[PDB]
Amino acid sequence: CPLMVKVLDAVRGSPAINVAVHVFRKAADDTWEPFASGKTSESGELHGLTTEEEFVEGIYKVEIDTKSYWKALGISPFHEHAEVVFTANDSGPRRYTIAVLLSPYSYSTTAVVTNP
Amino acid sequence: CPLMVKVLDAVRGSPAINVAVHVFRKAADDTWEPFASGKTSESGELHGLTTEEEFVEGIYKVEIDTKSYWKALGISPFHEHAEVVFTANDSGPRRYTIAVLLSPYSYSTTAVVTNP
Amino acid sequence: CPLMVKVLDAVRGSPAINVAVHVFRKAADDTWEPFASGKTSESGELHGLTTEEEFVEGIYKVEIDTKSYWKALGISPFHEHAEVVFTANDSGPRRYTIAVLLSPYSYSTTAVVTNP
Amino acid sequence: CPLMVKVLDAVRGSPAINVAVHVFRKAADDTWEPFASGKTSESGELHGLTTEEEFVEGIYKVEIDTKSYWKALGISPFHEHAEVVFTANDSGPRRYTIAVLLSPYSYSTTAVVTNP
């Protein structure tokens, strides 16, 4: 589990459940290639996106579909999505947790990077 | 103006208006003595709490009545309040802005400290 | 595990390890009674503070000694501590996760409250 | 002035000065077209990006070059940048302030949207 994504709802103090997440990797030609996708579980987490061996050095983008999450709750939020873009594994393999905290007009994101 | 508080509402995407703010200094016997108060303006700001000459070195507490704010909006809050506590002026007088971001189950606070 | 506390360092993207945490409960006379204490583990977490049966309804305060954490890293931070104050269990038993995100001049806190 | 960006540095407790900011509109073919740019002032603010008449309804992207900011300070950053993407003006013209808080491994962003 070198990459996991966790999403929380700051209005309810809860996991944000069933949030779509798409991950991309920047190719050598500079385009963004689809890399993995999934949706958050009942705990707000999304595990199993990749493997140590597939998750090579590169620039990755995690796109969180926050707008659909809010719209299903009846809210028209500010952001179209939350996108988190980062270089991974540039000094060897690491485990990444991308946390995102949602409010209708704000989001926060934090990365926790550990060396297993 | 040595101490400013600024509050934003992450649910509405607005300044947090009419939020009550109380300021305390720590007394000799470790108790919190009341020092200033006010409420945020239509821009979410509260100015005028103290003056340069009264705002001497010491430990100060700012307590933001978030619970009453959310209750006035009809939104269920988690916290009783949001407090910063900080030592002021320890390397000379400074201007302090306490920037606060509010959600019902989360807040943030940040000091912006500038030299006069 | 009705109460857990998790602390992260936003400078390094890591758990904040060995952070002291003191929990208080407001007594019927309005004073703050010591309730539990501990320090964060290697994962930034502090588990085992209380039990379902001891953690009755009340107003609780979680005091995080963030200043000592920064000072051990050579930094003189803004805040003396981070304090999180909240009513717990007012509509029956819940599980509370109090997360805190530390920077030298900022902290963030989020509560995740689940019904087991 | 319909679009303002304001950036704070949670490590220094200061405005984030000289941060490069690029603004894009989404074109008919889904591509991002460059729209404005600038850098934050000594107060961490960037004003003057557009005018009321040019800032028509559409989807806009603001991309904040956080990586270069942290590199200029000698501090190792996680993200390549911080971006908001939002639909503007969907219920009439608004003034938008994008408030951004930066740490090396975390950021936040919040929209403060006021009616003219």
Curated annotation (Swiss-Prot), chains A, B, C, D:
PTM annotation, UniProt: Not glycosylated under normal conditions. Following unfolding, caused for example by variant AMYLD1 'Gly-38', the cryptic Asn-89 site is exposed and glycosylated by STT3B-containing OST complex, leading to its degradation by the ER-associated degradation (ERAD) pathway. Sulfonation of the reactive cysteine Cys-1 enhances the stability of the native conformation of TTR, avoiding misassembly of the protein leading to amyloid formation.
One term of GO molecular function: hormone binding
Entry keyword set: Amyloid, Amyloidosis, Cytoplasm, Disease variant, Gamma-carboxyglutamic acid, Glycoprotein, Hormone, Neuropathy, Phosphoprotein, Secreted, Signal, Sulfation, Thyroid hormone, Transport
Annotated effect of mutating residue 15 to S: In AMYLD1; amyloid polyneuropathy
Involvement in disorder: Amyloidosis, hereditary systemic 1: A form of hereditary systemic amyloidosis, a disorder characterized by amyloid deposition in multiple tissues resulting in a wide clinical spectrum. AMYLD1 is an autosomal dominant form due to transthyretin amyloid deposition. Protein fibrils can form in different tissues leading to amyloid polyneuropathies, amyloidotic cardiomyopathy, carpal tunnel syndrome, systemic senile amyloidosis. The disease includes leptomeningeal amyloidosis that is characterized by primary involvement of the central nervous system.
Broad class of where this protein is predominantly found: secreted
Phenotype upon changing residue 11 to I: In AMYLD1; late-onset amyloid polyneuropathy with carpal tunnel syndrome
Outcome of mutating residue 33 to G: In AMYLD1; amyloid polyneuropathy
Consequence recorded when altering residue 55 to L: In AMYLD1; amyloid polyneuropathy
Gene: TTR
Effect listed in the UniProt record for changing residue 105 to H: In CTS1; amyloid deposit on carpal tunnel; patients show no other abnormalities
Outcome recorded upon mutating residue 50 to K: In AMYLD1; amyloid cardiomyopathy
Effect ascribed to mutating residue 38 to V: In AMYLD1; amyloid polyneuropathy with carpal tunnel syndrome
Gene Ontology cellular component annotations, sorted alphabetically: azurophil granule lumen; extracellular exosome; extracellular region; extracellular space; protein-containing complex
Listed name of the protein: Transthyretin
Effect after changing residue 27 to P: In AMYLD1; amyloid polyneuropathy
Result after altering residue 36 to D: In AMYLD1; amyloid cardiomyopathy
Family: Belongs to the transthyretin family.
Residue numbers bearing the Sulfocysteine modification: 1
Organism: Homo sapiens (Human)
Effect recorded for residue 38 to A: In AMYLD1; amyloid polyneuropathy
Effect ascribed to mutating residue 21 to A: In AMYLD1; amyloid polyneuropathy
Effect on the protein of changing residue 24 to V: In AMYLD1; amyloid polyneuropathy
Organs and tissues of expression: Detected in serum and cerebrospinal fluid (at protein level). Highly expressed in choroid plexus epithelial cells. Detected in retina pigment epithelium and liver.
Impact when changing residue 41 to I: In AMYLD1; amyloid cardiomyopathy
Assembly, per entry: Homotetramer. Dimer of dimers. In the homotetramer, subunits assemble around a central channel that can accommodate two ligand molecules. Interacts with RBP4.
